């Protein structure tokens, strides 16, 4: 991979981790609708990360 | 807002910014399918941030 692709892959992995950290924060606050949105977000983040891994 | 809600709101805003930064990285690499996924991701991130703002 190039250095620019490595950066992009690391960023997608970071976002994917961050959305799981926020999901647990929103579960601690019992913010139901926001946690449902956030779970979908983390799944969408994982889909991007895996797409980057396959391409790069 | 409580301090825990402020943290959660700041995290949602951070993710929303991060997905726009990655979108521009993926456009620079001409990674078409990944940028399309990432655009949708940033829209989904904005939807979570706005949902948090309205609740908190």
From Swiss-Prot, chains A, B:
Disulfide bonds: none annotated. The keyword Transcription applies. SUPFAM superfamilies: ROP protein (SSF47380). GO terms for molecular function: identical protein binding. The keyword Transcription applies. Keywords: Plasmid, Transcription, Transcription regulation. It comes from the Bacteria. Regulates plasmid DNA replication by modulating the initiation of transcription of the primer RNA precursor. Processing of the precursor of the primer, RNAII, is inhibited by hydrogen bonding of RNAII to its complementary sequence in RNAI. ROP increases the affinity of RNAI for RNAII and thus decreases the rate of replication initiation events. Antiparallel homodimer. This is Regulatory protein rop. It comes from Escherichia coli. The gene is rop.
